[PDB]
Design a protein around this nucleic acid. Structure first.
Ligand SMILES: Nc1ncnc2c1ncn2[C@@H]1O[C@H](COP(=O)(O)OP(=O)(O)OP(=O)(O)O)[C@@H](O)[C@H]1O
Ligand SMILES: Nc1ncnc2c1ncn2[C@@H]1O[C@H](COP(=O)(O)OP(=O)(O)OP(=O)(O)O)[C@@H](O)[C@H]1O
Ligand SMILES: [Mg+2]
Ligand SMILES: [Mg+2]
Ligand SMILES: [Zn+2]
Lengths: 643, 651
DNA sequence: TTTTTTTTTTTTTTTTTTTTTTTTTTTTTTTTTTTTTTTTTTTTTTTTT
DNA sequence: AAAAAAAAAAAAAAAAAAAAAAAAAAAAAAAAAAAAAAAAAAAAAAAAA
């Protein structure tokens, strides 16, 4: 229907004279600069934002979104033609593929014969000599689609979907152009690969071996060939977009090139790409017809909404965030912003913020002490333990939420599972691995299987998982902080029994928890009325009642916490005696009493990492005495409910 | 050889008959309206009741039920003509308009067991349960190619030869130009329709007991694909056909048969009800005319065969109506589902209340204490075993999403199962994970459970804690707990025995004529239509042997179903007077000194009790169709909670 | 309610059969057509009294 | 003027090679599926104050 020479001129015109004031208001050619950067081989990926294209040619954006594979090819053609005139120096040949490109180009010039018309097969395939790769960023005027509803009517179209990443293969080399050499001639043979399989060539087709009518067997080699970083992921529907009685649907996303190594399993992502078929020929197909599988050829992969990425590299922000972080009540404001719909539990929220920020990991002369804070909320029924855990799951960047026994066994640990790219046995992690450097919220901790409690022992202290079962012999790597929620021994605290007889945790597991918080709800008229007013306001308006400080948005909380995270403070010597005295005093009162939990050196280490976290929240580089004071006070408030 | 049919007399007559049946404008234009309606909401399949066709043209009806593809292609030509007449632009926007069939199939109503070879190429209705769905695959129906060498663009069409002979030239995908120039396919310009194969098994409760089940393969084409999922009880109407084998040279004479669906439908209990304008007028009249005591009128009319338990019936109405889910901006969730537990003495009609809600409520799932075990109750994770991948399997409480799980003998359920349902009973979701897959399935259900106390019978002289053998964590998420007690009072016995004996004497009018026995045996079911997928409604029941006589009527079951469906959608908003009353009420409930001595707590009072005060008040307001939660609603909620949460211990 | 043996039971495969599908594949005669002869039926230049 | 000749010269019949056309044409191997059974890990219910 349409003429692609004119479309190529259109996309050339867009690339050459589109400008924006992004550089601090200075008017830059957004894509000409990148053509410069990738003509000098300083850049590989060119993300063509289609919002930019739509500013001056919405019909082009419609055509792109309707074919989306013709236009990716057109854009690659156009940029490849524009690169020579944007090259202002000579590339340093940073790579080994670059040497092959340079030798091929130089040989082609050397035997040029510019006026002689060479065969269509006597040329280098375009894909063999590109070194860049071009991707679309979907127009924002396209509303994201739901994985279930991306069907045959959108094959070939550019669509945007979002879901949880459930499974990512390892990055492995996918052949793009298979290069062969001959045993007779000295020409190279190229076989661009489009299918998932290919039959390697046997005889060479070069001009010399045809003239000579020689054998000319050709040999497949990796050295001149083109591979691309390839990776296959499975992405899954979000829970709040599944039909009522249904399970979430998956989609295969084929990720190649510079989009690899972005998504990890557990990530919430938005993927823009072309919905494309794979011919699926070969089977003993029941039905006649050209049936095919489907996949999303990823163009843009964006983590989001709990695993947001770009803010991390954008730590520089407004003067405001400077002024709130500088404020003295910043710690109180961040603590209050944790689940504002839950009323009360101010100190619990302070401790939870400490778990999110965490302490500093020590590595002294090969004896690792982990800076993770593990917290257990040992509480009465209906005191909002699960709500706090679910909130912390929605907040923390790498967080997995686990209730009683749905995620038991290999749902926490790893399992060996078959792959598809290589058909061998890959290792897949469970909740403790999917939360490797984040939080794992274990709800109903007390009703957990004993094997899983043992695994949690070894995770909490050594921060690994040792498996020596039949198919698996590995030490997984689980650097997570455990946020546990449990009920006392008989579902409710019994003041007639002893504290550890209510906790029903062994001393070893009880010591694994830096802060173990008792939450009792004794009735009382004033506090019950206040709690009821808060709850009824939340029901009435879907928001917490207004207070003096507006709670921070969960994006701001993530950014503030992440900005705190890279702030390793050191305990000074001037605090050594103060900390030691606090620990000794705490230790003495532990056995002076008859209603105290197990206390050990881990209690000191808990003081020390809690105070390090508190110092970190103030963005200081040394721990002060107020941090140690706040750590001590939180440690007493953990059991304050007993009084 | 390529010929065209200059004149097919049969095709002409068939198309004329079908267009005549569809025009319908003189005969109260039902299909006229149906076609304009599918044009309106942008569909391209018309569901045609074969009873209407049998009325208008019986000869077509027989020909269509017996020669399915010929007649269906004629009828789809006629339908495209009709759509083009009504709207030519919409008609050109779709290449094909399909006709699905509906209604009563006499002997063409089968199960996967009785679907035999005497039905090949006939339209059949098959009922069963989905055992496996395939992936939804696109099948190319029109491939567009571009030759960069010559700038030419070609297109190649592929007819649906699924059940017809396919010669190998029919399925060649063009890769080269005639000059052997490489073609490249235009995926966004090519046309693909999506394709899916399911297997329908004979329903386990319909199959002969002890025999292995029988299945049928079913083909689903575009817009019919995602209509069923494994474990669904569906009705599939289609053509029964023998699939072509692969070009051989020797054949064993055996053909794979398959059902090519022309319509798929679910259990009609779970479908959106049809609402004639008179029905909406009647609902508005009901709600507006009787507003103070409408809730009690609906409640006492709930399970008419069960005498008494009026508070239990009010609570069950609240469960059927539900609170309103809160969806906070930060993603936090508060449930609007009401969970009810009945503990009682033997034979106090609590299994009967569970069964009534099973009959009445949409998406109600049964279960007994040990009939479901964890994985069978919540979801499961299995491995596909043919692709090597993890697969999620929905259990009872996922299938009951936006529905009810009616758990009976809840006490005899194992402790691990109740631990498993803790998370569903409050968060309305099932968190499940093996290592290759993790998911958070939606299970937004309300649990109606029946249990027996420890020792089988309730002990009046023991604390309800010592008598209900459940812990405060499990009890507290049951937001209403009713001790249904067998008191052997003689006047109560008068009342109950009278009611029961009166229910054991009633004959259904007309159907029963004096001595009839109801049963039918394994053929009589397929003889007539299924009252599970089948397509003037009064308001009050007429007086009969159910009741003697008085100045208070009985809401009809059908009207109550329609009314509850309408009222369930309402989202009454809590007012400030209601909020203050509920807050102070809850604060008073928590403080024990307000409640007498010798009166124990059946279940603990927590913040969940406040949430359930709100939920019950909201459900009451829904019943009145208020759009606001007024003080009467809050009072009814508080009195229900007050009745449920305390029991008098005797001595 | 901490410890402990049968029980499956989901997952790895392996077997393993039965059935459907796949893969492989020039030579040899015959016949029309054209271009030749060849006997016979004319027919067109030879001469006489 | 006709009477022998003595060729064309047309036909039927033959040959007579070509050069093209026409006519013959299952069994052996594989794979996939669906079903089994088996080693291992995992999840149940009987034990006692
Ligand atoms: N302090 C509170 N503020 C706001 N809401 C609360 C509070 N306490 C309880 N709730 C409400 O009560 C409901 C139950 O809370 P949740 O399920 O978190 O209890 P839980 O601590 O998990 O109890 P269990 O130990 O039984 O699991 C939630 O909807 C929550 O909103
Ligand atoms: N109040 C009542 N009104 C009408 N019928 C009743 C009543 N009480 C008992 N019945 C009759 O008793 C019979 C048994 O009732 P059901 O099976 O529901 O008892 P149950 O409470 O479930 O007993 P269990 O607790 O032992 O399971 C039913 O057929 C029911 O009709
Ligand atoms: Mg909880
Ligand atoms: Mg019962
Ligand atoms: Zn060669």
């Amino acid at each position: 229907l349409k003429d692609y020479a004119l479309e190529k001129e259109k996309v050339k015109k867009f690339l050459q004279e589109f400008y924006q004031d992004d550089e601090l208001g200075k008017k830059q050619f957004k894509y000409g600069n990148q053509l410069v950067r990738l003509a000098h081989r300083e850049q590989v990926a060119l993300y063509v934002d289609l919002d930019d294209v739509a500013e001056d040619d919405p019909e082009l954006v419609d055509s792109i979104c309707e074919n989306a594979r013709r236009y990716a090819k057109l854009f690659a053609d156009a940029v490849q033609e524009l690169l020579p005139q944007y090259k202002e120096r000579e590339v340093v040949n940073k790579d080994v593929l670059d040497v092959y490109i340079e030798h091929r180009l130089m040989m082609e010039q050397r035997s040029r014969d510019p006026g002689m018309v060479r065969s269509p097969q006597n040329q280098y395939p375009a894909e063999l000599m590109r070194r860049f790769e071009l991707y679309f960023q979907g127009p924002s005027s396209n509303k994201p689609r739901v994985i279930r509803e991306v069907r045959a009517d959108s094959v070939g179209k550019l669509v945007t979907v979002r879901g949880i990443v459930t499974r990512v293969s390892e990055v492995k080399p996918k052949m793009v152009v298979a290069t062969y050499t001959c045993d007779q001639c000295g020409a190279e043979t190229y076989q661009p690969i489009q299918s998932p399989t290919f039959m390697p060539l046997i005889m060479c087709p070069s001009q010399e071996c045809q003239t000579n009518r020689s054998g000319g067997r050709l040999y497949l080699q990796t050295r001149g060939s083109r591979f691309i970083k390839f990776q296959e992921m499975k992405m899954q529907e979000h829970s709040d977009q599944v039909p009522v009685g249904n399970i979430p649907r998956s989609i295969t996303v084929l990720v190649e090139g510079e989009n690899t190594r972005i998504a990890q399993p557990g990530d919430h992502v938005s993927v823009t790409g072309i919905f494309l078929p794979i011919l699926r020929t070969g089977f003993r197909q029941v039905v006649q017809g050209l049936l095919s599988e489907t996949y999303l050829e990823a163009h843009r992969i964006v983590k989001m909404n709990k695993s947001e990425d770009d803010e991390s590299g954008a730590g520089e922000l407004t003067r405001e965030e400077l002024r709130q972080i500088a404020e003295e009540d910043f710690y109180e404001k961040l603590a209050a912003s944790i689940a504002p719909e839950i009323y009360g539990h101010e100190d619990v929220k302070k401790a939870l913020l400490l778990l999110l920020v965490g302490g500093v990991d020590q590595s002294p002369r090969g004896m690792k002490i982990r800076g993770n804070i593990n917290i257990c909320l040992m509480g009465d029924p209906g005191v909002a333990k699960s709500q706090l855990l679910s909130y912390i799951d929605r907040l923390a960047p790498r967080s997995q939420y686990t209730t009683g026994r749905g995620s038991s066994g290999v749902g926490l640990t790893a399992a060996v599972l078959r792959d598809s790219v290589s058909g061998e046995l890959t290792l897949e992690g469970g909740a403790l691995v999917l939360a490797d450097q984040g939080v794992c919220c274990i709800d109903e901790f007390d009703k957990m299987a004993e094997a899983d409690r043992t695994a949690i022992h070894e995770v909490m202290e050594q921060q690994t998982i040792s498996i020596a079962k039949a198919g698996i012999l590995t030490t997984l790597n689980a650097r997570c902080s455990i946020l546990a929620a449990a009920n006392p021994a008989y579902g409710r605290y019994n003041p007639r029994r002893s504290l550890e007889q209510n906790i029903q945790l062994p001393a070893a597991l009880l010591s694994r928890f830096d802060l173990l918080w008792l939450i009792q709800d004794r009735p009382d008229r004033d506090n019950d009325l206040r709690l009821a007013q808060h709850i009824t306001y939340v029901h009435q308006h879907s928001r917490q009642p207004p207070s003096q400080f507006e709670p921070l948005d969960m994006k701001l909380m993530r950014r503030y916490i992440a900005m705190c995270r890279e702030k390793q403070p050191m305990v000074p010597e001037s605090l050594a005696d103060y900390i030691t005295a606090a620990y000794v005093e705490m230790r003495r009162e532990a056995w002076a009493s008859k209603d105290a939990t197990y206390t050990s050196a881990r209690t000191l280490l808990a003081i020390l990492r809690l105070s390090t976290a508190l110092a970190r929240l103030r963005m200081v580089d040394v721990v002060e005495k107020e941090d140690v004071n706040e750590a001590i006070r939180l440690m007493e408030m953990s059991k304050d409910s007993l009084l | 050889a390529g010929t065209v049919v200059l004149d097919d007399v049969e095709l002409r007559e068939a198309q004329r008959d079908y267009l005549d049946f569809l025009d319908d404008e003189e005969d109260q234009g039902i299909y006229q309206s149906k076609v304009r309606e599918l044009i309106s909401d942008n569909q391209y399949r018309l569901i045609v009741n074969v009873n209407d066709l049998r009325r208008k043209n019986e000869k077509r009806a027989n020909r269509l039920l017996n020669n399915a593809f010929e007649e269906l292609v004629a009828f789809q030509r006629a339908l495209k003509d009709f759509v083009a007449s009504i709207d030519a632009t919409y008609a050109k926007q779709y290449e094909e308009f399909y006709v699905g069939l509906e209604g009563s199939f006499g002997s063409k109503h089968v199960s996967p067991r009785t679907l035999t070879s005497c039905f090949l190429s006939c339209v059949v209705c098959v009922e069963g349960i989905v055992t496996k769905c395939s992936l939804v695959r696109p099948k190319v129906v029109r491939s567009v190619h571009y030759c960069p060498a010559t700038k030419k663009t070609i297109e190649r069409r592929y007819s649906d030869l699924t059940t017809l002979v396919a010669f190998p030239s029919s399925s060649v995908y063009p890769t080269k130009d005639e000059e052997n120039n490489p073609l490249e396919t235009e995926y966004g310009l090519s046309v693909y329709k999506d394709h899916q194969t399911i297997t329908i098994q004979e329903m386990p409760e319909k199959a002969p007991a002890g025999q292995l089940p029988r299945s049928v393969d079913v083909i689903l084409d575009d817009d019919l694909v995602d209509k069923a999922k494994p474990g669904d009880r569906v009705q599939v109407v289609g053509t029964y056909r023998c699939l072509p084998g692969k070009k051989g040279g020797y054949t064993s004479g055996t053909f794979r048969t398959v059902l090519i669906a022309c319509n798929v439908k679910q259990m009609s209990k779970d479908a959106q009800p049809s609402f004639s304008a008179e029905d909406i007028a009647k609902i508005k009249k009901f709600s507006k005319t009787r507003s103070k005591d409408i809730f009690d009128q609906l409640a006492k009319s709930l399970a008419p065969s069960i005498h008494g338990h009026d508070y239990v019936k009010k609570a069950i109405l609240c469960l059927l109506l539900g609170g309103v889910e809160r969806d906070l901006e930060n993603g936090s969730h508060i449930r609007g589902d009401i969970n009810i537990l009945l503990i009682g003495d033997p034979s106090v009609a609590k299994s009967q209340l569970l069964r009534y809600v099973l009959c009445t409520a949409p998406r109600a799932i049964p279960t007994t204490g040990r009939g479901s075990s964890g994985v069978g109750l919540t979801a499961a994770v299995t491995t596909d075993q043919e692709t090597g991948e993890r697969r999620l399997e929905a259990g009872a409480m996922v299938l009951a999403d936006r529905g009810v799980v009616c758990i009976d003998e809840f006490d005899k359920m194992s402790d691990m199962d109740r631990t498993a349902i803790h998370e569903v009973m409050e968060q309305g979701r099932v968190t499940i994970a093996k290592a290759g897959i993790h998911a958070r399935l939606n299970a937004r259900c309300s649990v109606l459970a029946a249990a027996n106390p420890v020792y089988g019978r309730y002990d009046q002289y023991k604390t309800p804690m010592e008598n209900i053998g459940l812990q405060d964590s499990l009890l507290s998420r049951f937001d209403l707990l009713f001790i249904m007690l067998d008191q052997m009072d003689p006047e109560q016995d008068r009342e109950i025995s009278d009611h029961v004996l009166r229910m054991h004497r009633y004959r259904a009018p007309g159907e029963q004529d004096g001595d009839a026995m109801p049963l039918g045996s394994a053929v009589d079911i397929l003889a007539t239509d299924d009252p599970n997928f089948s397509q003037i409604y009064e308001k009050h029941d007429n007086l009969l042997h159910g009741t003697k006589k008085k100045k208070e009527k009985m809401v009809s079951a059908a009207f109550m179903k329609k009314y509850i469906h309408v009222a369930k959608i309402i989202k009454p908003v809590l007012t400030q007077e209601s909020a203050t009353y509920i807050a102070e009420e809850y604060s008073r409930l928590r403080s024990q000194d307000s409640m007498s001595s010798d009166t124990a707590r059946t279940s603990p009072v927590t913040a969940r009790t406040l949430e359930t005060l709100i939920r019950l008040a909201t459900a009451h307001a829904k019943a009145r169709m208020s759009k606001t939660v007024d003080l009467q609603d809050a009072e009814e909620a508080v009195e229900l909670v007050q009745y449920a949460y305390f029991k008098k211990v005797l001595e």
